[PDB]
Design a protein around this ligand. Structure first.
Ligand SMILES: *[C@@H]1O[C@H](CO)[C@@H](O)[C@H](O)[C@H]1NC(C)=O
Ligand SMILES: *[C@@H]1O[C@H](CO)[C@@H](O)[C@H](O)[C@H]1NC(C)=O
Lengths: 375, 351
């Protein structure tokens, strides 16, 4: 089998730390002594503002260099082009980006859904009347789950899409929800928008005893929550990456010693997306390893490597690449990593964290099969 | 003579018949307008990208076509980056996107205005994950503002018994048309608002509803001269020769296709009358180099103002219809009748 294995890396705007985590996972693999060995050789494009034109260029450039798989990120503007070219051409996508519920061939989604976790929490707290503040940046899957469970179980929901809100609109909205005696909230937003809302909640003085916030994010620990600690509003969230396992700790010993100029973003600990990104590299490694144990000499000679070729010429061995990827089962910074036939994370787990005066404390954890098991 | 692209869905036979008839109607010999057709699954971004790229390669000056929610970014990004104008009857994007000429009127404001007209505060909203959730967001945002009690069930990938216990008397249907029939059945007194622009476009009347009230919207007004004149030709075309023709009606998307042809054609007559010449392709070139006369074509398209099957046709600077009328319709025992209109400045109007 060959000494190198060729992959794509496709990163978007504001992904320094993720790219750091990708470069490290590939460096340590390429220099590991651990006991059919190979070097991972990346071909990288960072496309700034992510849009279908830029994502097709990057893809086609990487498809023409002979990559067998592409580690890639997307947003709502590029997800469908990138998944659609991958599934057309039989190149697999390994991605930390937001999951979709429908409908994935050739796409391997490291990021687990927050849907199940989020709905079991609303049950436990017995939430009837609440506001759902959201944006469409990671799709509509959460919003549908919520408005269906409102209909199914007879709740009341104030569901507002906060995309394109300026800062008064938040205060104006929080004022109007003040007058309706609205105290309980689920917020489900992209991180930059979350931080802003949290500032706005504070300005209004709604960060105190009485008020409740469930934050649909996978890195509760990375949210700066000082004024809510003091104010005394009850705030709950999730945390995928469990720092006290020895696998994460081992990584953190390295991460702490990294040179900040080589590896920007290593000055703070890894966000859930950075941790997924390293896990992605470990999944690509395990998969090539298992293909060699299966005795399949995958290559992309002398296939044309033009992505707009008519007739479309899918990669014949792409099928085995895909099938093996979806059977992977290994441990990573995000805990046990495996997937189902449709490529989505399964048998995964994440901690539940509650904000108290001591700071954020683990009150339990949620696993997709066992559901919520409290402490 | 001007070559253009056409991107049709493979099941879109009536609309291609309306396109062919428009080409004949709107020609004069002063330039040949000459279509290049591709048929394809418009849900597939890879296929749509290929088709766009074949077209750019040959030298289309504009492209007529379609998209759905999975391919809308392919189109708007490629057209936006390369400065190729796209004219379409597909669902209009929320935001602004240069080089996109949206033939289809926005339905939301008229929908919202109609709910306020009937004074509904409780209502059930049945919606479709396959078509996109753009309108459901608008109504949920308005319900939060106006303290409406909106019970919102997905029926697009029984719901019968949940309707009863929750007990919602009004219903808004924002689904594919085939499903509309099935859902009335489960329930068989009630009130229905059909959330689309062709209330009379397929099955209706004796759907049936059991004598319920039905409201809906129509952009094509068969009392107009142009429309009844058009239908006199359409209704007598040979169906073997023009599939989906030889009928008393036309689907709204087919009417917008025929209107498209007029707008493209008028935009190019404007450039000749103003003496602006246009001449003379790689999708993946780097850096991207948009063709230089594209801006002039876009500007001419948005400056078009004509009448056609969908009423007054005019665009703002972001390619969205303005100054349109949507007729408000009810199903009377006699037949679908026009109880009024939502106009683009005056909102809902009786008589
Ligand atoms: C889930 O993972 C656990 C280890 O965390 C393991 O014991 C169990 O077999 C897994 N369940 C599956 C694959 O169904
Ligand atoms: C709006 O439409 C009417 C005809 O329907 C026309 O009289 C009016 O002038 C139009 N507005 C314009 C051209 O700004």
């Amino acid at each position: 089998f060959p000494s190198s294995v060729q992959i794509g890396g496709l990163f978007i705007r504001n992904t320094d730390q993720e790219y750091t985590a990708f470069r490290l996972a590939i460096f340590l693999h390429n220099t590991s002594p651990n006991a059919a060995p190979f070097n991972l050789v990346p071909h990288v494009d960072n496309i700034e503002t992510a849009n279908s034109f830029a994502v097709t260029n990057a893809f086609c450039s990487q498809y023409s260099r002979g990559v067998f798989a592409i580690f890639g990120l997307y947003d709502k503007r590029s997800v469908h082009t990138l998944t659609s070219f991958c599934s057309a051409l039989h190149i697999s996508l390994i991605t930390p980006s937001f999951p979709t519920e429908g409908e994935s061939q050739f796409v391997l989604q490291l990021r687990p859904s927050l849907r199940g976790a989020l709905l079991s929490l609303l049950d436990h707290y017995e939430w009837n009347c609440f506001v759902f503040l959201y944006d469409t940046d990671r799709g509509y899957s959460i919003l549908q789950a919520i408005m269906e469970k409102a209909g199914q179980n007879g709740w009341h929901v104030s569901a507002i899409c906060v995309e394109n809100f300026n800062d008064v609109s938040y205060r104006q909205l929080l004022e109007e929800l003040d007058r309706r005696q609205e105290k309980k909230f689920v917020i489900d937003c992209e991180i930059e928008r979350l931080q802003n809302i949290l500032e706005q909640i504070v300005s209004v003085g709604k960060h105190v005893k009485g008020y409740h916030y469930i934050i649909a994010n996978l890195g509760f620990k990375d949210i700066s929550l000082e004024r809510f600690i003091h104010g005394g509003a009850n705030v709950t969230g999730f945390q995928l990456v469990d720092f006290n396992t020895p696998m994460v700790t081992k990584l953190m010993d390295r991460w702490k010693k990294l040179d900040q100029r080589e590896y920007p973003g290593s000055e703070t600990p890894p966000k859930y997306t950075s941790a997924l990104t390293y896990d992605g590299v470990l999944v690509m490694a395990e998969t090539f390893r298992s293909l060699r144990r299966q005795k399949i000499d995958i290559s992309r000679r002398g296939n044309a490597g033009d992505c707009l070729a008519n007739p479309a010429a899918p990669w014949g061995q792409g099928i085995d690449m895909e099938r093996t990827l979806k059977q992977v089962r290994i441990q990573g910074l995000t805990g046990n990593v495996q997937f189902d036939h449709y490529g989505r994370r399964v048998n995964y787990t994440m901690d539940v964290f509650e904000l108290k005066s001591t700071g954020p404390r683990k009150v339990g954890y949620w696993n997709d099969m066992d559901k919520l098991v409290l402490i | 003579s001007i070559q253009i692209g056409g991107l049709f869905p493979r099941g879109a036979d009536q609309e291609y018949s309306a396109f062919r008839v428009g080409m004949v109607q709107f020609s004069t010999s002063e330039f040949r307008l000459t279509p290049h057709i591709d048929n394809l699954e418009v849900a597939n971004s890879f296929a749509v990208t290929n088709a766009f790229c074949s077209q750019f390669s040959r030298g289309v000056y504009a492209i007529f076509g379609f998209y759905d929610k999975k391919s809308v970014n392919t189109i708007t990004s490629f057209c936006g980056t390369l400065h190729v104008s796209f004219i379409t009857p597909s669902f209009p994007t929320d935001g602004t996107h240069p080089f996109v000429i949206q033939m289809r009127p926005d339905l939301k404001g008229a929908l919202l205005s109609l709910i306020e007209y009937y004074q509904w505060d409780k209502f059930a909203y049945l919606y479709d994950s396959d078509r996109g959730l753009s309108t459901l967001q608008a109504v949920l945002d308005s319900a939060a503002e106006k303290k409406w009690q909106v019970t919102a069930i997905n029926v697009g990938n029984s719901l019968f018994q949940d309707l009863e216990l929750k007990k919602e008397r009004r219903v808004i249907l924002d689904c594919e048309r085939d499903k509309v029939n099935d859902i009335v059945d489960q329930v068989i007194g009630y009130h229905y608002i059909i959330a689309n622009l062709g209330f009379t476009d397929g099955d209706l009347l004796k759907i049936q509803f059991g004598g319920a009230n039905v409201s809906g919207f129509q952009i094509v007004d068969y009392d107009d001269s142009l429309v009844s004149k058009f239908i006199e030709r359409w209704s007598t075309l040979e169906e073997k020769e023009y599939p989906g023709a030889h009928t008393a009606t036309i689907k709204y998307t087919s009417a917008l296709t025929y209107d498209a042809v007029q707008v493209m054609t008028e935009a190019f007559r404007n450039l000749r009358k103003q003496r602006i010449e246009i001449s003379r392709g790689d999708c993946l070139a780097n850096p991207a180099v948009p063709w230089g006369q594209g801006v002039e074509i876009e500007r001419a398209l948005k400056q078009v103002q004509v009448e056609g099957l969908s009423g007054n046709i005019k665009f703002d600077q972001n390619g969205k219809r303005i100054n349109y009328t949507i007729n408000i319709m009810e199903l009377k025992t006699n037949g679908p009748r026009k109880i009024g209109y939502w106009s683009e400045v005056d909102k809902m109007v009786v008589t």
